[PDB]
Design an enzyme around this catalytic site. Sequence first.
Site, PDB file in Angstrom:
ATOM      1  N   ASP A  93       0.845  -1.178   0.000  1.00 34.68           N
ATOM      2  CA  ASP A  93       0.000   0.000   0.000  1.00 34.68           C
ATOM      3  C   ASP A  93       0.891   1.242   0.000  1.00 34.68           C
ATOM      4  O   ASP A  93       2.060   1.184   0.391  1.00 34.68           O
ATOM      5  CB  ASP A  93      -0.956   0.004   1.187  1.00 34.68           C
ATOM      6  CG  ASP A  93      -2.129   0.940   0.975  1.00 34.68           C
ATOM      7  OD1 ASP A  93      -2.265   1.491  -0.145  1.00 34.68           O
ATOM      8  OD2 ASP A  93      -2.919   1.119   1.923  1.00 34.68           O
ATOM      9  N   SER A  94       0.325   2.364  -0.434  1.00 36.83           N
ATOM     10  CA  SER A  94       1.099   3.560  -0.757  1.00 36.83           C
ATOM     11  C   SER A  94       1.272   4.552   0.390  1.00 36.83           C
ATOM     12  O   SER A  94       2.084   5.474   0.283  1.00 36.83           O
ATOM     13  CB  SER A  94       0.402   4.282  -1.899  1.00 36.83           C
ATOM     14  OG  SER A  94      -0.912   4.628  -1.502  1.00 36.83           O
ATOM     15  N   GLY A  95       0.509   4.380   1.471  1.00 36.35           N
ATOM     16  CA  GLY A  95       0.440   5.374   2.529  1.00 36.35           C
ATOM     17  C   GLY A  95      -0.827   6.220   2.488  1.00 36.35           C
ATOM     18  O   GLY A  95      -1.124   6.929   3.436  1.00 36.35           O
ATOM     19  N   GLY A  96      -1.593   6.121   1.405  1.00 31.62           N
ATOM     20  CA  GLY A  96      -2.788   6.937   1.224  1.00 31.62           C
ATOM     21  C   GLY A  96      -3.883   6.787   2.264  1.00 31.62           C
ATOM     22  O   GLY A  96      -4.666   7.712   2.488  1.00 31.62           O
ATOM     23  N   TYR A  97      -3.959   5.624   2.899  1.00 30.79           N
ATOM     24  CA  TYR A  97      -4.903   5.440   4.001  1.00 30.79           C
ATOM     25  C   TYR A  97      -4.441   6.214   5.227  1.00 30.79           C
ATOM     26  O   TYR A  97      -5.251   6.837   5.921  1.00 30.79           O
ATOM     27  CB  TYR A  97      -5.041   3.963   4.353  1.00 30.79           C
ATOM     28  CG  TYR A  97      -6.080   3.663   5.414  1.00 30.79           C
ATOM     29  CD1 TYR A  97      -7.408   3.423   5.071  1.00 30.79           C
ATOM     30  CD2 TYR A  97      -5.733   3.598   6.759  1.00 30.79           C
ATOM     31  CE1 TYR A  97      -8.363   3.134   6.040  1.00 30.79           C
ATOM     32  CE2 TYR A  97      -6.685   3.315   7.737  1.00 30.79           C
ATOM     33  CZ  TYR A  97      -7.997   3.078   7.368  1.00 30.79           C
ATOM     34  OH  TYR A  97      -8.946   2.797   8.331  1.00 30.79           O
ATOM     35  N   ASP A 146      -2.655   7.843  -3.014  1.00 32.23           N
ATOM     36  CA  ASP A 146      -3.988   8.433  -3.025  1.00 32.23           C
ATOM     37  C   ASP A 146      -4.279   9.078  -1.680  1.00 32.23           C
ATOM     38  O   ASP A 146      -3.421   9.144  -0.803  1.00 32.23           O
ATOM     39  CB  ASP A 146      -5.042   7.342  -3.298  1.00 32.23           C
ATOM     40  CG  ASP A 146      -5.109   6.284  -2.194  1.00 32.23           C
ATOM     41  OD1 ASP A 146      -4.062   5.966  -1.587  1.00 32.23           O
ATOM     42  OD2 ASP A 146      -6.216   5.749  -1.951  1.00 32.23           O
ATOM     43  N   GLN A 193     -11.566   6.507  -6.044  1.00 28.78           N
ATOM     44  CA  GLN A 193     -12.164   7.177  -4.892  1.00 28.78           C
ATOM     45  C   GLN A 193     -13.536   7.716  -5.297  1.00 28.78           C
ATOM     46  O   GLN A 193     -14.110   7.243  -6.285  1.00 28.78           O
ATOM     47  CB  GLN A 193     -11.231   8.266  -4.345  1.00 28.78           C
ATOM     48  CG  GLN A 193      -9.894   7.703  -3.820  1.00 28.78           C
ATOM     49  CD  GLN A 193     -10.024   6.940  -2.500  1.00 28.78           C
ATOM     50  OE1 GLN A 193     -11.010   7.078  -1.774  1.00 28.78           O
ATOM     51  NE2 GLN A 193      -9.014   6.133  -2.184  1.00 28.78           N
ATOM     52  N   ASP A 270      -7.539  -7.376   1.214  1.00 27.44           N
ATOM     53  CA  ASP A 270      -6.621  -7.394   2.358  1.00 27.44           C
ATOM     54  C   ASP A 270      -7.395  -6.950   3.580  1.00 27.44           C
ATOM     55  O   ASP A 270      -8.319  -6.145   3.470  1.00 27.44           O
ATOM     56  CB  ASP A 270      -5.444  -6.429   2.169  1.00 27.44           C
ATOM     57  CG  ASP A 270      -5.822  -4.989   2.475  1.00 27.44           C
ATOM     58  OD1 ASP A 270      -6.416  -4.324   1.590  1.00 27.44           O
ATOM     59  OD2 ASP A 270      -5.564  -4.526   3.613  1.00 27.44           O
ATOM     60  N   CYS A 308     -11.944 -27.506   9.445  1.00 27.27           N
ATOM     61  CA  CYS A 308     -10.712 -26.834   9.052  1.00 27.27           C
ATOM     62  C   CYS A 308      -9.536 -27.797   8.939  1.00 27.27           C
ATOM     63  O   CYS A 308      -9.329 -28.636   9.812  1.00 27.27           O
ATOM     64  CB  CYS A 308     -10.387 -25.736  10.063  1.00 27.27           C
ATOM     65  SG  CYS A 308      -8.864 -24.841   9.699  1.00 27.27           S
ATOM     66  N   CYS A 310      -6.336 -26.927   8.816  1.00 29.17           N
ATOM     67  CA  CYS A 310      -5.078 -26.321   9.239  1.00 29.17           C
ATOM     68  C   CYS A 310      -4.350 -27.145  10.301  1.00 29.17           C
ATOM     69  O   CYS A 310      -4.938 -28.005  10.962  1.00 29.17           O
ATOM     70  CB  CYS A 310      -5.282 -24.872   9.686  1.00 29.17           C
ATOM     71  SG  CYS A 310      -5.591 -24.593  11.454  1.00 29.17           S
ATOM     72  N   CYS A 313      -5.820 -26.986  13.910  1.00 30.30           N
ATOM     73  CA  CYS A 313      -6.999 -27.811  14.145  1.00 30.30           C
ATOM     74  C   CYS A 313      -6.703 -29.302  14.113  1.00 30.30           C
ATOM     75  O   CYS A 313      -7.468 -30.095  14.659  1.00 30.30           O
ATOM     76  CB  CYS A 313      -8.112 -27.444  13.165  1.00 30.30           C
ATOM     77  SG  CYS A 313      -8.743 -25.773  13.472  1.00 30.30           S
ATOM     78  N   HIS A 339      -4.530 -20.409  12.406  1.00 29.97           N
ATOM     79  CA  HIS A 339      -5.860 -20.898  12.086  1.00 29.97           C
ATOM     80  C   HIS A 339      -6.700 -19.864  11.317  1.00 29.97           C
ATOM     81  O   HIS A 339      -7.344 -20.207  10.330  1.00 29.97           O
ATOM     82  CB  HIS A 339      -6.639 -21.334  13.319  1.00 29.97           C
ATOM     83  CG  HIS A 339      -8.094 -21.482  13.034  1.00 29.97           C
ATOM     84  ND1 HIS A 339      -8.618 -22.584  12.386  1.00 29.97           N
ATOM     85  CD2 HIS A 339      -9.122 -20.617  13.207  1.00 29.97           C
ATOM     86  CE1 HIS A 339      -9.918 -22.404  12.216  1.00 29.97           C
ATOM     87  NE2 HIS A 339     -10.246 -21.218  12.703  1.00 29.97           N
TER      88      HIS A 339
HETATM   89  C1  LIG Z   1      -9.708  -1.336   6.765  1.00 33.20           C
HETATM   90  N1  LIG Z   1     -10.346  -0.759   5.600  1.00 33.20           N
HETATM   91  C2  LIG Z   1      -9.666  -0.078   4.668  1.00 33.20           C
HETATM   92  N2  LIG Z   1      -8.318  -0.245   4.476  1.00 33.20           N
HETATM   93  C3  LIG Z   1      -7.931   0.607   3.475  1.00 33.20           C
HETATM   94  C4  LIG Z   1      -6.683   0.860   2.906  1.00 33.20           C
HETATM   95  C5  LIG Z   1      -5.461   0.068   3.315  1.00 33.20           C
HETATM   96  C6  LIG Z   1      -4.867   0.419   4.650  1.00 33.20           C
HETATM   97  C7  LIG Z   1      -3.563  -0.332   4.890  1.00 33.20           C
HETATM   98  O1  LIG Z   1      -2.991   0.315   6.050  1.00 33.20           O
HETATM   99  C8  LIG Z   1      -2.780  -0.662   7.071  1.00 33.20           C
HETATM  100  O2  LIG Z   1      -3.953  -0.700   7.898  1.00 33.20           O
HETATM  101  C9  LIG Z   1      -4.114   0.496   8.670  1.00 33.20           C
HETATM  102  C10 LIG Z   1      -2.640  -1.970   6.283  1.00 33.20           C
HETATM  103  O3  LIG Z   1      -1.379  -2.103   5.658  1.00 33.20           O
HETATM  104  C11 LIG Z   1      -3.759  -1.805   5.264  1.00 33.20           C
HETATM  105  O4  LIG Z   1      -3.500  -2.657   4.128  1.00 33.20           O
HETATM  106  C12 LIG Z   1      -6.667   1.857   1.885  1.00 33.20           C
HETATM  107  N3  LIG Z   1      -5.445   2.169   1.262  1.00 33.20           N
HETATM  108  C13 LIG Z   1      -5.391   3.089   0.355  1.00 33.20           C
HETATM  109  N4  LIG Z   1      -4.220   3.417  -0.231  1.00 33.20           N
HETATM  110  N5  LIG Z   1      -6.501   3.788  -0.042  1.00 33.20           N
HETATM  111  C14 LIG Z   1      -7.755   3.568   0.468  1.00 33.20           C
HETATM  112  O5  LIG Z   1      -8.731   4.192   0.065  1.00 33.20           O
HETATM  113  C15 LIG Z   1      -7.846   2.535   1.520  1.00 33.20           C
HETATM  114  C16 LIG Z   1      -9.077   2.250   2.119  1.00 33.20           C
HETATM  115  C17 LIG Z   1      -9.095   1.271   3.110  1.00 33.20           C
HETATM  116  N6  LIG Z   1     -10.149   0.841   3.864  1.00 33.20           N
HETATM  117 ZN   LIG Z   2      -7.880 -24.463  11.781  1.00 35.45          ZN
END
Ligand SMILES: CNc1nc2c(CC[C@H]3O[C@@H](OC)[C@H](O)[C@@H]3O)c3nc(N)[nH]c(=O)c3cc2[nH]1
Ligand SMILES: [Zn+2]
EC number: 2.4.2.29
Lengths: 373, 373
Positions: A93-97, A146, A193, A270, A308, A310, A313, A339
Amino acid sequence: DRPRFSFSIAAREGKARTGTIEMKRGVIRTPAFMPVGTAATVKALKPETVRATGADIILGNTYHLMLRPGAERIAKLGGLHSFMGWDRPILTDSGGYQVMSLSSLTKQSEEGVTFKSLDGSRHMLSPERSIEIQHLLGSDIVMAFDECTPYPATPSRAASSMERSMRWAKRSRDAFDSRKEQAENAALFGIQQGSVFENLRQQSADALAEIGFDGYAVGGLAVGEGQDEMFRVLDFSVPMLPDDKPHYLMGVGKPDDIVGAVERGIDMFDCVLPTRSGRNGQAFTWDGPINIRNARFSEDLKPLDSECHCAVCQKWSRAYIHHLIRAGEILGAMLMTEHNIAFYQQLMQKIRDSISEGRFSQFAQDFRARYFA
Amino acid sequence: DRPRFSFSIAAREGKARTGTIEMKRGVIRTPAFMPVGTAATVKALKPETVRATGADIILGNTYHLMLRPGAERIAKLGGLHSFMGWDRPILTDSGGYQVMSLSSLTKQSEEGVTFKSLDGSRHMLSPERSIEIQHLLGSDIVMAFDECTPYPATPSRAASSMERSMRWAKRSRDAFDSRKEQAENAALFGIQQGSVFENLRQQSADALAEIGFDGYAVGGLAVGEGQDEMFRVLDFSVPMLPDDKPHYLMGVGKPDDIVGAVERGIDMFDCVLPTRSGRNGQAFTWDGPINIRNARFSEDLKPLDSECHCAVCQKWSRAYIHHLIRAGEILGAMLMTEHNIAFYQQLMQKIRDSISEGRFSQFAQDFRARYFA
Ligand SMILES: CNc1nc2c(CC[C@H]3O[C@@H](OC)[C@H](O)[C@@H]3O)c3nc(N)[nH]c(=O)c3cc2[nH]1
Ligand SMILES: [Zn+2]
Ligand SMILES: CNc1nc2c(CC[C@H]3O[C@@H](OC)[C@H](O)[C@@H]3O)c3nc(N)[nH]c(=O)c3cc2[nH]1
Ligand SMILES: [Cl-]
Ligand SMILES: [Cl-]
Ligand SMILES: [Zn+2]
């Protein structure tokens, strides 16, 4: 040898698809679930264990790795794959969250985002720097930089945010393409978006398709909107994306969320739920989640789940895992996590097989009937 | 099929011995190191991983298991072996160390010891109850219920404590023998006390030999006396024990402590050092311990130890483990612990092989020269 990137759809049922993404480091079976490993580790699991559960690809995060141990450091050490001992594809992921979730730490501009606080230390992200970090990590699937629009958002603010993300998507594309080794060996996904608004989702899809990407994520969901609303937005949003490329729903989700998202055309997922809630004592079963801490499990000799396959289990009882989690023992976290990730992968396998056999609708119905009984 | 208990000495060099203990659940190679698992888990390791490092036997503890999850509960669930998934021998300590270490929680009498505080809950131990708990757990090597005399102790108090322990040793013997299934399938070890005093150590050895046990532990050491003093006491104490039975030094220790104790006739060891200090960032190497948290390891691509054959050293760098431990990641604890236990087992293997080949004195000298360089 495998190509840089090739997505092939082998079978379909309604909006659902099953197939493969071939990349240099391996094949990804879709629909796919990606275990999350933000700190260069899927928490409490060796990479060999992650693979044994059936995972084809894991997720890392530009933001966390930028802070610790550092992007340049990981590059000096030979890249993220060598560093953590996972030799298969990694999506970063890019950091956008974090632009949204840690916004109080930030100063944002059209150029990018600077995060503050090592106490009070500053770290910058931008389309260019995010793509550069993902190169330094040696990511196989690079996400565009993003902004995950906060929820709820007014149409005006959702539009402004989405428009900035589309400008950043073009900058991400150009940064990626300007780095020959990255362009030739990795893939780049754009992120749609537009909050919950159909017109903005359409504008975003059109902008991303015009730029052109290897895959398209649905961003801006799983941010508190609830399943009904998320599904409503997916209903119109997924068909806007190019049909012949993967569709990645970021942050989803609970097992039922995954099933419904696949019914709506999603190929990749994810979520930290199986790992994080596993450490907290929640185990997934075909009859719904259980909390292993509950006193009712103290003398329960059955495995976490009755079907399961795994390793957990096959060997340990609910009673033992109950004891471990109550005692705060590390082995408790290890077993719960293995698990849960295995359960998620078995879910994805059942989804893939049922689509391949044209009985996914029946699977979804049967799954829900039992999971929510 | 294997006997209940048979200790055979295959080779000797000075006071050092190497051989085997055959028991129903498996063979124990001596000198042996027993990983500690007080809460029915060797912390941060699956039992299969404990076995992969070379461990033949692990240690559990009557006191901890009595409190959580409960002795009767473990029996109802099929015993400790089934509960935790370790099918090889288990030695259980009796609680006698906790009589000392948690003395402020206790009321002691000739009958036994009651521990207080589940808040303010009381739990009793006595020779009879300790042996009963160890039966309920299904322990293979049962330890007599003793008192670990605090250090330092006056000769008068050391004598009183030792005398009580010898009375408790006879009661332990009789309780064990009165339970047919236990007497026929498990072994019972007596524990020598007497603090640092030769005459009291002799009286204790004589009392234990008169009662008769399958093995003899040297108790009351590794309680702050330091290596010089511990070795001084071992010099006279070990020869007092029957030569043809195993000699178990409780709570030892650092690698050099183990080597010197073997030079003085010890066959068995337990210590939390490799597990606990592993989680704290200390890794054992043939060139001495290192603390992986140190900044000097942040970009060190070498394995924890240059010669170690463990899975951790085959795959991950110091730099990665440094990152994990600094980040408080569970995988950090897992990898450090697996390496340290593997290191300890490789130490025991080198000791066994060198005694078998009549070159243990040389091994000890070479080991010390390099470890303390
Ligand atoms: C939970 N729901 C959700 N996750 C999201 C993530 C991943 C967070 C990533 O940040 C970390 O979790 C805080 C983990 O590495 C996760 O993959 C998103 N990432 C980006 N770039 N843009 C989004 O619009 C976005 C929306 C999300 N909604
Ligand atoms: Zn299991
Ligand atoms: C560290 N040095 C040391 N350990 C010792 C232990 C084991 C503690 C046991 O208690 C737990 O550790 C606190 C673990 O299970 C450990 O095996 C002892 N046990 C008995 N019964 N009698 C002793 O005289 C004694 C002396 C020790 N000296
Ligand atoms: Cl997590
Ligand atoms: Cl420990
Ligand atoms: Zn090692």
